[model samples]
Target chain A: GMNVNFINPFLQSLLNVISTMASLELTPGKPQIKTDNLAKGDVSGLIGMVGPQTKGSLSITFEQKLVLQIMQNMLGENPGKINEEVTDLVGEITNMVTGGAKNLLGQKGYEFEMATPMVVSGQGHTISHKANGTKIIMPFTSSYGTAFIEVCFE
Target chain B: MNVNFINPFLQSLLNVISTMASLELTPGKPQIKTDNLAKGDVSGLIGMVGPQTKGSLSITFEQKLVLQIMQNMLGENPGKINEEVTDLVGEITNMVTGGAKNLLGQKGYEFEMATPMVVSGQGHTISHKANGTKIIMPFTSSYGTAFIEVCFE
Candidate 1:
C-alpha cells in the first residue's frame, strides 16, 4: 500500500511541469497498479528519493512523438528523433517534477533527498524500481501524445 | 580520481557474490568505458547519494551467467531470464552497493542508496547520474563473464 499523501504531489507536479514548461496541458487518466516492468513509453527518466520516513523512486516515460512535441513546444524545434538532446530534456523534466513534488511534500513537513536522474530510451526497454512495494502508474494525455508517471514506495 | 572510488565496488562485488551465491569471481583490470551502450544482456543499476559525493553503480551479466547465478542462489535453475531472474539481479545490485557503501563508510564517507533498477535487453544504453569518469571492471567466473561499472562525482 502507498501513502495517499504521496500520490497527489507527483500527479500535480507532472501536470504543472508539463503545462508550465512545455505549455501542454495534460489530462490525467486513472492510476493503476503496474503488473509488469515493461516500459509504456520509448523514453523514460528515472530518479530515486530517500527520506527519514520514506524511500521510493519516480519515473516519467514519454512516447517518442510526445517528447518531440515537448521539445518543439519548449525550444521551437524538434530533433525529429530521440537523441541525446531529447533524453537530456527528459532528464530535466524528471528532475523538475521530482523537485516540485519534494517541495510540496516539504510543505507538509516531509523531507527527502533526491538522486540524479537517469534516462533510458529504446524500443521495448524495461524499468525495475528498487522498492518492493506497490507501483502506481499514472497516465496522461495531451494533444500531442501520451506519457506516464510511475511512483513506488517502500 | 577513479581508482580510489573503484576499489570498494570491485571488492564488494566479489564479497557479495561469493557470500550469497557461493560463487567465486576474479576481477579484471579496470578499463575506461567510452560509450553508453550496455555490454551484457541483463543489467542492474543503482544510485548512491551522499553529502559530499554522488554516483551510480551498474552490474551487467550475460544471459547464461545470469541464469547460472539464479540457479546457484535459489537452488533452482530458472532456465530463462524472466521476472524472477531480473528481480534477483536487482537484489544483487542492492547488496553489492550496500556492501560497498559500508566499506566506504568505514573510511568516514557517508552515503544513502537508491533502489535498484534492472534493465534487460541486448545493447540497451545506460545513463549514469553522475558526470564522472565511467570505469568498467570485468569479472570472470566458472559460469561466464559479467562486469561492474562505477562512476562518482
Candidate 2:
C-alpha cells in the first residue's frame, strides 16, 4: 500500500509541529474527527506553493468559539467597540497561517510569492475528499472562543 | 449553479488564498463563528492575477507543518526537513492560484501578479470582508497539528 510513504511523512510533520508549536494534543487514529458544533459559523483561508512542485492545495474550515476570542484580544484596545474589526482580525490570522506554510515551502526552492488573506462566516458545512481515508481536527484556544480545523484527504 | 464571481476593490488580496487552500478543511459542519486574528511565524507569501482582477495568494503555515505537508503532498519522507521543501510548497500554491487566475483572466477577468514574501513572520495577518460574501476556508493537513486558510473575493 502507498500508505506508508504518505503516512510517515504526514505523521512526522504533525509530530514536529505539535512538539514545537504551542499546540495541544487530542484523541487520534484516522478518519474524520467527531462533528463540530454544527450550529456555529465557518470562515475561509488560503495558501500558495513554490519549489519544484507545480501546483497548490487549497483548504477551508472554521472554529466554533476561539475566533471571537482572538478578535477581542487583537482589537480590544481600540477606543470604540470594534466588532467589525474582530472579523477582520480573524481573516488576518488565517492569512498569516496560510502564508506561513508557503514560506516554509519557499525555503526548499519554492521561493517567494506574496499571497494575501481573507475572512468568511457561515453556518454548518463541510468539504470532503473521498479518495483519502483520513480526516483531521484542529482545536485552538485563542483570545476568542474554541476554534478548530476539520478536514479529510486521500 | 457552478459559478463564482466577486466585485473588484472590495476584494482582498488574500481572497484567492482562501479560494485555493481549502482542500483539507475539518471533516464536519460546525455552527462556527470565526474572527480575524494576528499571525505567527510566516512561511511563504505570493501573488497571482486574472483578466480583470488581481490576486496575492500567499501561504504561512506551521514550519514543521509545512515540512510535513510537503512530504505528504509529494509522497516522500523528507527526513530532516529544511528550506528547500518548504519553498517548494510555496511554488505549488503560487502556481495553482496563478494558473486559476490566468484561466479566469482568459474569460475576460483582468489579472496581475506580485512578488512573494518569504520569511518567518512578516507582519500581522491582514483581514477582509466580501461585502457580505465570504470566499475563505480553513483546512488542516494530515498533521492535525496545523491548519491552512484560503481567502478570496
Candidate 3:
C-alpha cells in the first residue's frame, strides 16, 4: 500500500473539484484496495503522472446518471445522454482534479509532470494503470449517484 | 502527410509481432481516422512527450487474433479474452512504442513514453491526448485484422 500522504492530495482534490465546479457535494467512503481492472462505472477519465522518483496514474469513473446530473448543473441544461459532451466534461474534470492534486503535491516539495487526460467510455470496459503500485479505489456518494476515484503510484 | 513520421511505428510493430509471436503482418493503406470508436475489441493506448513534439499511439486487435498471438507467445492458447490477453496487449504496445522511439531518436526526435493503458470492450471510445491529425494504419494477418493509430503534433 502507498503512504496515505500520497493519497490524500487526490482525495482532497476530487472533493474540491466536484463541489466547486459542479456545485455538488460528494461524501467519500473508505478507500479500498482494488483487485480487478474492470471499471466500476460507464465512463472513466484517466491521466498519468511522472516524477523524478515516482510514476503513477489516476482515474475517475462516473455513472451515466451522475454524469448527466453534473452536466445539467454545470451547463444549465441536461444533456440527457452520455454523448460527446458528457465524455468531454469527464476529461475536463479529470484534468482539473489532477492539476489540483499536482499543485498540492508540489507544495509538499514533490515535482511532477502529467500527461493529457484520456477518456474511455463503454459498458464493462477496463482501465489498466501503467503503475505497478497497489491500486486504491475511493468510492463516493452524492445526491445524484455514485462515483469512484482510483489512484496508484510507485 | 506524416508518412516519414509514421513509418517508424509501422516498422516497429511489424518487427515486434513477427519476432516475438512469429506472425507476419501486411500493411494496408494509411488513412485519416474520422471516428472515435475503437475498431477492435481490445486496445492499448500510450502517450509520448518530447522536447519538440508530443503524441499518442493506440493499437486495437480482434479478440481471436489476440488470443492466438498470446498462444504463440506463451505456447498455450488462453482460449478466450481475459486479463491475461489484455495484459499481453499492453506489453506489446510498450515494446512497439519503445522500438519506434529508438528509431525516432536516431533522427533527433527524442521523446519519453508513458505506461500503456489497456481497455477491452466492443466499440469502446479512445480519446488520444495529442492535438494532431489522427492517422490510422491497418494491418492484416492470418489471425485477424488490427490497426495502429498515431496522432503527433
Candidate 4:
C-alpha cells in the first residue's frame, strides 16, 4: 500500500510557500489520485524528482491572473510579458516548494534529487505521467484565482 | 540566430519517420515559437546540453499518429496507446535527436543528451527558453501531423 506520507509534506509546504511568497492565502481542495480528466492551467512549473526509493515529478500550475498577481508581488510590477525572468520565477517557486518538501521527506529516509524546474505556459496545456506511477492532483483556490499542483510517482 | 540549424534536424526526422513508417512527411516553413509550446496528446521531451548551447527539444504528436507510427515501427498494429506506446515515442525521438546530433557534432558542435521523457495528456503546453529563436519544424502525413522543435542558445 502506498502511504500518504509521500504527499503530506509537499502539501504542507505548498500551502506555506504560496502563502509566504505570494502574500495571499490558499485554500487547497482535496488531493485526488487520478487516471483521467487531468486539469491544466495557463502556466506550469515542473520539476522531475529522482531517488533510490522513488521517481516522479512535481507540477505546479497557475491560472493566468493568479500567476500574474504572484509575479507582481515578486517583481514589484507587471512582468509585461512572460520573458526569461518570468519563466525563472515559475521555476524558482517550484524549486523552493520541492526543496522544502525534500528536506522533510529526507528525514523519512527518502533521498531525492531535483532537476532544474521548467515552466510550460500556454492555453489548455496538459500533463501526463507514465503508466508505472500514480498521479496525484491537488487543486487550490485563492483570492486571485485557482491553481493546481500535481505529484506523480511510482 | 539564423545559422540555418533548422534544416538538418528537419531532414533527419523526415528520413527517420519515412523509413520507420508508411507515412510521408511534408515539412512546413520554420517559424519562431516562444512562450507557448503547441503540443498534442503525447510528446517526447529531450534536453540538449553542450559547451556553447543549452536548451531542450520536443516532438509533439497526436494520438492517431502515435498509434500508427508505433504499429509500423514494431511491425504490428498496436492500434492503441499503452506503456510500450509511450516508450516507443521516447525511443524514436532519441533516434531522431541522436541522428541530428551526430550530423551536428561532425560539423564541430559538441552536445550532451539527456534521457528522453514522455509526456501524455490533452491540451497541455511545454516551453523551453533557448539561447536563440525557437524554430518549430512541423510535418504533416496522411496518418497525422506532428512537430519537432529546437531551442538552443
Candidate 5:
C-alpha cells in the first residue's frame, strides 16, 4: 500500500547516478501505471529487495547502443561486444541505483535487504510484475538515448 | 553441489497447476539445461534471493497451453494473448513462487519473492549469466508441455 512513496527515490536516484556515472542528462518523462507486461530493453539490470514492510523488484533497462555508449564513456574506449565487463557494468549501476534509493527511503523506516543483482540480456526482453501488483515505470529521456526505471512492490 | 532446494518448487508447481486450472501436469525427469531453451511465445521469470542462495525461476510455456490455462483460470475464452493473457503469466509465476516460498519459509529458509517478468517473443533468445548450474523440470500438459527451470547459487 505504500507504493507511491518508493517511486521518486528511484527516479531521483536514476537522475543522480546516471548523470554522474555515464554523464548523460536525463529528464523524467510521464510516469505510467502498469500492472503487467512491463517491457525491457536488450539488456536489463535486476535487483530484488525484501523489507519488513516492502518487498518487490527494481530494474533499469538500457538500449544496446546506448549501453555501449555509456560503457565506452565509463571505460574511455569502445566496448566491442557485450562481454563480462559490460554485464558487470549493468549490475553495478543497478546496485548503485538501489543503494541510493534505499538510503533516501531509509529515513522513512524502509530497511531493505539487498539481493545480488542479475543482468538479463536478449532481444526485447520484457519483465512483468504479479497481476495484483501494480508497478510504476518512469521513462527518462536521455540526451544520448532513452531509458527507463521500473519499480514494483507489494 | 547439493540440490535438495529443488523439490519444494516442484511440489509447489504441481499443486498450483492442479488446483488452479484443474490440470494434472506430470513432470519428466529433471535435466540440466545450460543454454536457454527456445521460449514458447511467452514466459514468466521470477527471482529468488536469500542468505544462502540467489538466482532466477523461469516458466516457459507454449502458446496453446498458456491459452488453455488462462481460459480455465478466467472462465472465459481468451481469444489471443493480449493484455489479460500477459498479466496471467505474471500472476501464475507469483503464485507458483509464493507456494514454494511458503514451504521454504517453514524450513527456516525465508526468501524474498520478487515480482515475475514476462518475456514475449517468437523464438527470441533469453540469455542468463552462468553464475550457477540450472536445472530444468519439464512437465507435460493437455495442450502442450512447458519447462520450469531453476538456477540458484
Candidate 6:
C-alpha cells in the first residue's frame, strides 16, 4: 500500500478518463511536469488530497468545446455558448472529481472533507501547490483535445 | 504601521452588505478558530491564496437563502443546477468577497490584482483554514448572506 505518490493516482485518473472516452490516449510518459505552453483551454474539475498519502491532487482540465460536449452529455441540453454557465459547469465538475477521489481514498482509510471548486483560467497558468519535492504535473491528449492533471506531495 | 488594526474599517466592509442585503453573519473570536455554525445554511464563496494574503476571503452560508439567491442569480431552477451553475457559484464567492475587498481596499487597504476563485460543488467539506479577525463585521443581505473568513500563510 506504500505505492503512495500523488502523481501516481493523478496519472491513473487521466488514463481512466481517456480510456473511458475511447477517443483519446495518453502519450508514453503518461505524466509530465507542469509547463507553460502555447496550447491552453478551460479546465473544469476540483481536487482533493490524501494528506499522509502524498499531498498532491486529482485534477481535470477540459477544452471549452469539449466541456460543452461533456456538459451536454451530463445536462441533456445544448449549452450553445461557453460563458458563465459553462464556467460554473466545469468548476463543479472539479467538485465532482474531488468528491469522487475523496470517496475512492476513503475506502482505503484516507479521508478529508471536500472544498468548493476553484477555476484556474488563462493560458500558461499553473497551480503552485508543491509537495515532497517533485512537482507532479501530467499532460495527456485525446483526439478531442488535451488536459493536464497534477499532484505534488512533498 | 499595520493600519488594518483599525477594526472599524474591516467592520465597515462587512457591515455595508449585511445592512443592504439580508444575511446572517455571526462574529467570533480573533484567532485559532471560531464556533462552527451548529445551525443555518451550508454554502460559501472562496478566493485563492495570494502573495499578499496567502489565503482567501470567504462568506459562510445560509443554505436556503443561498439556494434562493443562486437560483435567481442564474435564472435557473435553483434546486437543479447544471455543470455551468456549479462553477458560477464558486466564482460568485470570489466576486462577493471581492465586493468587500474592493470596498475596503479602495479605502486604502492596499490589496490588489487578485484573481477570484470559487469553491462549491462538493457533498462534504471542511477547512482547517481558520476564520480571520472580525476583519470586517459580519453582514446580511436579502439577496444572499456571508461572513468574513480571512487567513494568510
RMSD of each: 2.8, 16.3, 2.6, 5.7, 3.7, 14.9
User: Candidate 1 chain B: worst 10 consecutive residues by lDDT?
Assistant: B121-130
lDDT of 6 by residue, B51-148 (tens): 24433344444544556655555554456433354455445544555564565566665433133223233221223232333232244545444444
Q: Output the lDDT of residue B64, model 6.
A: 49
Q: What is the DockQ of each candidate?
A: 0.57, 0.10, 0.54, 0.22, 0.36, 0.04
Query: Which interface RMSD values do the candidates have, in the order shown?
Result: 1.7, 12.2, 2.1, 4.6, 2.9, 12.4
State the DockQ, from 0 to 1, for candidate 1: 0.57
Q: How well is each residue in B1-153 modelled by candidate 2, as lDDT tens digits?
A: 013433222133234334435335342221112754534233344434333333443344544555555555666545533345545654654564456555556566654444333333322243333223333333355543222333344
lDDT, candidate 6, at A73: 59
Winner by DockQ between candidate 4 and candidate 2: 4
Clashing pairs in 3: none
Model 5 CA lDDT for position A55:
72
DockQ-best of 3 and 5:
3
Which regions in candidate 5 have their CA more than 4 angstroms from the true location?
A: A1-5, A30-40, A75-88, A131-134, B18-28, B31-33, B51-53, B75-79, B124-132, B140-145
Cα lDDT tens digits for candidate 5, B30-139: 77775545456677777777657776777777778888888778887466666687788888888888888888888878777766767665443344443677678888
Per-residue accuracy of model 1 over A1-154 as CA lDDT, tens digit each:
8754466898998888778888988898888788765455777787778888777788788888889988998889988887778887887888889899999999999888787777776655667675878888777988777888888887
TM-score of each: 0.86, 0.37, 0.88, 0.66, 0.78, 0.43
Q: Report the CAPRI category for model 4.
A: incorrect
Return the DockQ of model 4. Answer: 0.22
* Model 4 per-residue lDDT at B26: 73
True contacts kept of each: 0.53, 0.18, 0.45, 0.22, 0.43, 0.00
* Span of ten consecutive residues with least summed lDDT in model 6 chain A: A122-131
For model 2, the DockQ equals 0.10
Given the true complex, what DockQ would model 3 score?
0.54
lDDT by residue for model 3 (A86-122), tens: 8778878887888888999999998876767677777
**Every candidate's lDDT:** 0.78, 0.39, 0.76, 0.70, 0.72, 0.44
